[PDB]
Each structure stands twice: as structure tokens, then as C-alpha cells.
From a paper:
The envelope glycoprotein HA of IAV is the major target of neutralizing antibodies. The globular head domain mediates the receptor binding process, and the HA stem leads to virus-cell membrane fusion induced by the low pH in endosomes. The representative antibody 28-12 exhibited broad neutralizing activity against both group 1 and group 2 IAV viruses in vitro and protected mice against H3N2 and H1N1 virus challenge in vivo. Our two cryo-EM structures showed that the 28-12 Fab specifically recognizes the conserved HA stem region for both H3 and H1.
To provide the structural basis of the unique recognition pattern, we determined the cryo-EM structures of the 28-12 Fab in complex with the trimeric HAs from HK/68 H3 and WA/11 H1 at 3.7-Å- and 3.5-Å-resolutions, respectively, with imposed C3 symmetry. To overcome the preferred orientation problem (preferred top-view orientation) associated with the 28-12-H3 complex, also seen in the H3N2 Hong Kong HA trimer (HK/68 H3), we adopted the stage-tilt strategy for data collection. In contrast, H3 contributes only two epitope residues outside helix A to interact with 28-12. Specifically, H3 D19HA2 on the fusion peptide forms hydrogen bonds with T57HCDR2 and Y112HCDR3, and H3 W21HA2 on the fusion peptide forms hydrophobic interactions with V109HCDR3. Notably, H3 has a unique epitope residue, N49HA2, which forms strong hydrogen bonds with C102, N106, Y108, and V109 on HCDR3. Overall, the atom-to-atom contact numbers between 28-12 and H1 or H3 helix A are 144 and 191, respectively. It is worth noting that the H3 residue N49HA2 contributes much more contact numbers with 28-12 than the substitute residues T49HA2 (10) of H1. The site-directed mutational binding assay also confirmed that N49HA2 is critical for H3 HA binding to 28-12, while T49AHA2 did not affect the binding between H1 HA and 28-12. We synthesized 6 peptides with single substitution mutations from H3 to H1 and found that the binding ability decreased significantly when there was a mutation from N to T at position 49 of HA2 compared with the wild-type peptide. Nevertheless, the continuous epitope within the helix A of H3N2 HA makes the major contribution to the binding of 28-12. However, cleavage of H3 HA0 may not change the overall epitope structure, therefore the cleaved H3 HA still maintains the reactivity to 28-12.
Numbering used by the authors:
A (entry chain J): 1 to 214
B (entry chain A): 276 to 327
C (entry chain B), D (entry chain E), E (entry chain F): 7, 9 to 172
F (entry chain A): 9 to 110
G (entry chain G): 1 to 229
The structure:
Amino acid sequence: DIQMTQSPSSVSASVGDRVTITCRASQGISSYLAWYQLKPGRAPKLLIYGATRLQSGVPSRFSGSGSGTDFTLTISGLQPEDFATYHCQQADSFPLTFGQGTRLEIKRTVAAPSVFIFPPSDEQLKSGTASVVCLLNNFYPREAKVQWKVDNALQSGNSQESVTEQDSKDSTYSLSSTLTLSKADYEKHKVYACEVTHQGLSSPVTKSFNRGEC
Amino acid sequence: TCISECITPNGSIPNDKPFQNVNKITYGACPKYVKQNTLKLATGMRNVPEKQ
Amino acid sequence: AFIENGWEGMIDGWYGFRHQNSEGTGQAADLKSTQAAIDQINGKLNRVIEKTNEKFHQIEKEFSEVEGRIQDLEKYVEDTKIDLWSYNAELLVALENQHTIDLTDSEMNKLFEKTRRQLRENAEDMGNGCFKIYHKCDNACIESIRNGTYDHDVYRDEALNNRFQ
Amino acid sequence: AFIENGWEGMIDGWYGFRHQNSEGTGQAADLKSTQAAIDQINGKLNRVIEKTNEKFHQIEKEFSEVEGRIQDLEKYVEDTKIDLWSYNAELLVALENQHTIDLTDSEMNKLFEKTRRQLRENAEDMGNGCFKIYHKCDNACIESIRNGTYDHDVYRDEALNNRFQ
Amino acid sequence: AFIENGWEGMIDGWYGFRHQNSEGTGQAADLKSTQAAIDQINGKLNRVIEKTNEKFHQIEKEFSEVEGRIQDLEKYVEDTKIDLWSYNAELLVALENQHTIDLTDSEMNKLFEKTRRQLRENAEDMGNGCFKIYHKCDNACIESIRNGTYDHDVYRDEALNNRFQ
Amino acid sequence: PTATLCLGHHAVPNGTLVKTITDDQIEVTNATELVQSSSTGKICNNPHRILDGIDCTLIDALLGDPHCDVFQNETWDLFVERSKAFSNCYPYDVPDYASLRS
Amino acid sequence: EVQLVESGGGLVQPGGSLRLSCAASGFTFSTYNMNWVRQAPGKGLEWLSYISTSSNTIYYADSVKGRFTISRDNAKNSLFLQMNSLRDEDTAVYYCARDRGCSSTNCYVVGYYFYGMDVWGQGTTVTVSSASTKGPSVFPLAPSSKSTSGGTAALGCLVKDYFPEPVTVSWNSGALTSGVHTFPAVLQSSGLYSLSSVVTVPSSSLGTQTYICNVNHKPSNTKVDKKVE
């Protein structure tokens, strides 16, 4: 199956900059390439059809060209209300394999994230479960590394996390790493910690707490 | 002091073109005034650009 | 557009050939089919852009003082012939651009017919505008089909032993 | 009209193929040549029937009271621009219907060229728009020429043993 | 113009054939392709030179007494529609002569296709508009391809022994 | 034996879109613009004899305005009337102003 | 105007059967082609099927393998998307789109899907899970002083083991909205969703300002309020 390889995975640019989004293939889709504007919680809209012409209703801030396999989505009229994820659809031929998609974000200043942690309360330990929450706020970009260690030993395969969307005013992000524990596993271990690795931090800042300090 | 076979009120234009969009009031050997400003007459084949 | 791609390095003509044999590669513009196409292209230009002007006394087309019916007649008269010349501009130049693509397709079809009338039992097409020569073709053989002086009976016994075998 | 007859049962496209082998018969519309023809047909429509209107203030064209020379002047221009638009209607639409038959002939010629560039040593024409395949062609072989993914070197050794023998 | 020369002695039609065999030579006009071409030629005449006149009351176009603005309006009115009819005369008749050369090329291409759909394995082209028949073709064989009643499977085993050998 | 003979055309990387019948915009190798969208900004005095009506119009030279005394028995081919022209004499009225000026 | 309205969604078990709908209005349904494109959570778009106006040219994707059936009716101007042999991977939001047809502005002669799909509907959420409706379990989080020079302290509430998604979580019944971050729900080992919500507050208002994390669930009518202190 032909895979619509896009490059890069995410573009960070401010208002007024030029965005270059590429989407290659393995055959001739010079007149059979469709670009869409996918938004979270909204219906998709056809941006550029046939990789050469503009869809009606869309203003002239967007542009694009390319035939054979090389294509370029050039946005010289980028507005702050037009930040969304774009995808390329192959129309020649069936099956209609979609691309990976490039998430367009606003270029902001890299700030130092504030490391937070949460011990388990008494309402959760009496129910028969346990969970350690590691909160990260005010970090940019989303490429942040977070690792877990229990009693000077790293663990994996039992941790989850959630990433918030981009704010419209502060343009920040939030991350809450949740570790899955139980009632018997909480009394077995004593020391819990959360490693925070960020590009803006000159030293890895971590927090630790004991099981008896709830 | 120049040579021009067509006179127009917004600047004289040469008469080597069949149409114009400068002004409707003309004098002499002038092109015809049309509302279409873009008339790209192709002088060759279509652009087919290489694969690699 | 069944030509897959043209030649960007050939800037000495509108058409030509790209040879490839043991003596090397290269591009050479055809002196026959290119000159026969410019006579059809430039003949379309001089009957439109040259000697098509009218030198006569016109009337006033823009007015500052609104008089009434006398100005309302010539306003509908002038706006008609402007739109009639604009409709003829959308009729001529859009058809001249449409015929030029058909002219370059016909000049390619005449070039495919001139090459096809000399390479029946000697070569076959490939599908991308190239011909698969089934015999030895040096630089003199390339210039024989380019100048139209190629012989079919000379290379007949050589290419037929490798075409269907 | 050298196609003897079309296909009335194919209502899912303007063009297509009619296969016939040991796995049965049937009709299938070509997704390549049909869509390439509507882009040339509908492109002729939207530049004529759409965005070709003029919104401006016109004058009185019908009069009940005969005044004289002032009404005789505007009547001669109005009867001309109606006849000039009628002559352009007999110039455009009659040529657009003439080019559409030439467009469907060119789309058939491009379909005959796309099929002809893959069936040189594998098949031959019959005379009624059909190709006589000299090898085994199943339903996957029909869809290979329909989608343009047919290979000439694969079925070369099979059909050449039954073409001239 | 790839026909090298026509036939001046054939005055009984626009098209035809020139046969040459053991029973002598001669020229014979094709009754099929000539009549199919006049229907396209004479169809272009009667929609232009016939029933295209306008019978109505016109105005005075030439004046001896110069009145002023009333005569200056109709002078620019009359000189435009004369030039508009002259531009349409240079648009129609120049394209009608251009399409007629393309019509005679298409009627020759249909004649080459009608002869090509019956002489695939029986004959080959020569390069000057003539076909090299590789089998015995008498006067009845010439009239079979002229009337379109030629059979390909009859003369298949005779011409294939001398085409590639 | 064995060779390769291709039949192609010239390709230009920097083309422009044209207007045709089948499509709306299609890039070609080379194309010219038949509409003069630019001008020199100044009127040339050759080959036509251009007259400069700086202080007078055409009617002011015909009636005898004192600001056009240099146009005595002067012939021309095209009269250029400026927008800043004015009359500094006895005022006149021309009924059917486009009649006598033409 | 042109608008596509989807229907037939809801909650189903892995192994059931449904029949989606695509209500069309504002245009002639018997002249345009239809399709079926979904949107998987965490992945991109995925084309499934395609139908024509003549109902003779029907195509399917590689992941379908005949498990789905797509039909239409010109008398009702709607689609019939039959869903059979479902699994946990098919839990996504389904959409129906209309093909463009040509390369011009307005396609008076409709062609095929070779020039994108300019019409998209709102879509409906189809959840395929064997878990039933379960109320949320609110667990508070005890805050603590972390930033010495800044003097800030974070606090929140954990909404775990609920079904189905989503749950509108706020603070003080919508009174505290500044600095509130809503995290998306993630899948657990038991198949139930779980999210969280925090709010940036200074450390001076820990023992004075009362922070009540309100949790309200619509289809289960469960309202559990836990004080965060």
C-alpha cells in the first residue's frame, strides 16, 4: 500500500511567517491531490483540490503547487485563527490512503516548566487503589521527556498521561502523568519520584515524597 | 520627445499589442480597450515538468 | 500530457531528440519540426497583434456634466462595444491558447508520424514518448531520422531478428 | 462514428470497457478516461454559463410613442447588438458542439493510445473499437489496462506464439 | 503536406485510390470518403452564405450636411458595427479555412484508419501515402477496400509469408 | 544493437498561467500578455503633432481668449486639454458642447 | 444550503449490528456520489467505502473485507451504512462526505472522487464497548508547598472509572474559571475513561479559599462533590 509520507511532523510559526508543508507519494497525483483543514471538534473542509487550484469560499491567503511526487503547501497569509492540522488525500487511485498530518502550532518563547507532584489522599487508599500524579505546567514545545522511578529503579508499561490543547491567550500546555498502582503495591514501595526533562531546564528538577507523608 | 504610434491619457503605450486596459479614449493606431486586464497568449506547449 | 516529461536542458528549440547509445548521451533540437511549428505559431501572432488597429476620429466617452438622453444613448453604445471587444477577447485568445495546445499536439503527432513512417519493422514505442530501437543506432543513425534521411530497407534485416525474438 | 455501436447498459460513466472471457461478461466504466473528459467538458460550461453576466443600467428598448430620429438611432443599435449577440451565439455554441465531438474523439484517441501503448505485441485491433487479445486475460488483466498498470513484458511470450501463428 | 503529391488526373472526386498491379494501372475515386467529406464541407456553407440575411429598416449612413453631435453619434455607431462585422469576417472565414484543412486531414486520417483497420497483417505503409500490399491484389481486391468490404482473415496466410520474410 | 530515441518538447521551470477553453488556469512554457498594463506616463510628440493646451481648451482657442495668443494659425493632430484649464475672460455657454468640439 | 446530517449513533457492544444514516438537503442526492470516511482517535482519516448514483460501482477498503454494507435510496435521499462484525478498533467518529466531481468552481456535470470532497457533515459518536454506564469516582488531591520563591501550590481532582465520555468538570459551579486546564480522557486497563482537571492557585489561599471540584455526569445523573483541601 502506498503511504502518503509527509515532512515534517509539526510546524511552529508565528503570525505572518511562511509555512511549507510537503506531502510526497510514489506515483503521479499532480492533478489528483486534495488538501484538507482538519480541526478538533469541527468538520473538515477542502482547502486545495487537485494540488493546483483553490476551493471556493476559501480566501486567497493559501496557495500551493506541485505535480509528479513533490508538492509544497505554501501559506504566505497565515492568520492566528487558521491554526489547524492539514492532511493530504490521494485520489489516484483506490484505496484512498490518507496522510499522517502536520500539526501547525504558534511559535512561542521556551519557558521553564514548573514541576509538581501529588501524594495519594486518604479517599483513594481506602477504596483499594493508588495513583501518583506528576503535573507539568508552562512548557513549550510539547516534546518533553518524563520518566518514573520507584525506589531508585525505573519502571515502564504502567503509566499514562494527558496533553491539553493550546491556549488562545497564554499559548501554554499542561501535562499530567498518571502512574497505575494498586492497594498492595502502594504498601510494598516507600519512595516515589518523577523525573522531568525539558529543553529549557539546565538541570533535571525532580520531586520525591514518602508513603507516610500523605 | 519619443516615438509612439498610440496615444492614451494615462501614458502612451506601444501598438505591438492587440488589446489594452489603459483608457477607453484613444487616438490613432491604438489597441482596443477591453475590461479583461489579463490575456496570457501562449506561445508554446504546456509546461510539463520533470519527475526527478 | 503520452509524454511523461519534457527536457529542461534543451534550450535551443521547442522540439528535439535525446539519444542514448554506446557513444554517449546528449540532446539535439530537431531543425525540421521546430521550424515548421513556429511558422504556425508566429503566423497566429502577426494577424492579431500587428496591423489590427483602427485610426479614426472617435467621440467623447467620459463626461462630467450629465445632460440626459444624449449622454445616455452613447453610454449604452460605448459600454456595448467595450463588452463586445471583451467578449471577443475571451473568444479569440482563449481559443488561440486552446488551438496552440492542439497545434503542439499535432506537431508532436506529425513528429510521431515522421518517426513512425521510418521505424515500422525497425523499432517500437515505449509508452513515454521514446522509441525502442532494436538495432545498432550510432550518432549518424540519430541524425538520419532527425533530418528525415533514414532508410527502412537498410536496417530491416538487423532489427527484425531481435524484435520478435 | 470507427466505433459501430456504443453501450446502453453502461450508465455509470461516459466511457468504459466490455470484457469477455471464461469468467463471464460484463461492463465496467473507466475511472481514468471518463474523469479526464468531464474536466474538459465542465470547463467549457463554467466560463460560458457562469460569471458572464453584466449588471449595469440599461436604457429603454421598447417605445409606444414614436418621436423620430432619437428613437430611430437607439433602435438601430439595439437591433444590431441583439443580432451581434445572436451571431456570437451561433458562433460559440455551434463551435462548442463541434469541438465536443472532437473532444470525445480525442478522448477516444487517447484511450486508444493508452491501450495501444500496452498492446503492441500482445493484441491487435478488430475494426469495431474492440481489441483482439491473443493471450489469457482474466478480470485482473482487464483492470490492469483500465487503471493503466498493465505490463507489456509479462504477456509478451504468450501472445506472440498465437498472433502470427 | 505525409502525402508527397496528389493526383491531377482524378477529376471525379476529392479523394480516391491509385492502383497498380499486373492488370494495369488507373485511378478510381472513393465513393465513401468523398461523399462523407462534402456533407461536412457543404454543411459549413449553407449556415453561413444562406439564410443569414436581415431584412429591416436601417438608418441613414452617409450624410452630406454636417449637423453635429447627432451625426457624430451614428458615425461612431456605424463605423464600429462595420468593423465588428469585418472582425467577425476575419474570425469566421479564417477559422473556416483553418478547419477545412483540418477536415481534409481528418478525412484522410479516417481513410487511413479505414485502410489501416483492414491491412494490419496484410500490408504496411510506405511513407508517401501509399500502402505496400504483401499479397496478390487484383482489381476486385482494390474495390473491396474501396467499398469497405475487404476481409482480413482471407489474405492473412498469404501476406504474412512475405512481410517479415 | 539496442538504442533509445525519445520524442519530447522543451520544458521551462518558470512559466505562467494562461486562459484557454478546456481549463481555467494552466501553466505553459512561455506566454505573452496581449494587454498593455503599463505605460511610460508621458505623451510622445512623434509621429503625431501633439498640441499642448496648457492655459486654454479647444473652445477657448476658437472664441478668442487672450490666454491662447500663441496658437495663431496653428495646426495639429491631437489636442490635449488639461484638467487645470480655466477661463479668465467673458464667460460663455456652449449648447451641445460635444457637437462643436468634435 | 448544502448540509449533511448523520444519525444512527449510540452505544453498542463488540459484536452487534447498527445502520447509520446520512441525511442530505439542499441538493439533488441522485446526481452526486457518496462515501464513508471515519476518524480514529489518535490516528488520521481512513476511507472505508464508496458508492455511485447508479448503485453498480461499489468499492471497499482493505480493512473492510466485506464486513460493512453501504446502500442508498433516491426516494429518501439518504445512505444505509450497515455495520457488522465490529471490534474495539472500530470505535471512532464516522462521517459521510460528498464528492466534488470536477476541477472547476461549480460542477454542473458530476464526475468522480478525483478532486476531493468539499462537503462534510457534523458526524455522530459511535462507541463500541462492552462496559455499561457507571458513575464517576472522585478522588481529591492534597496540595503542598513546592515553589519557595514563587509561593504557588497546585491542586486538582481525579475522575476515574466512569462511562461514557465526557464529564463536564468545573470549580465552584463555574465561579473559578481562571487557570483551569481540562485534560482529555485516556483508556485504562479495564476499558473505562479517566481524566483530571487542575487550577493554578497561590499558596496564600489554601487554608482560606474553599475549592469544591464539581463533577456532573449527564446520562448517569451522578453528582459527586469532593472538597479539595
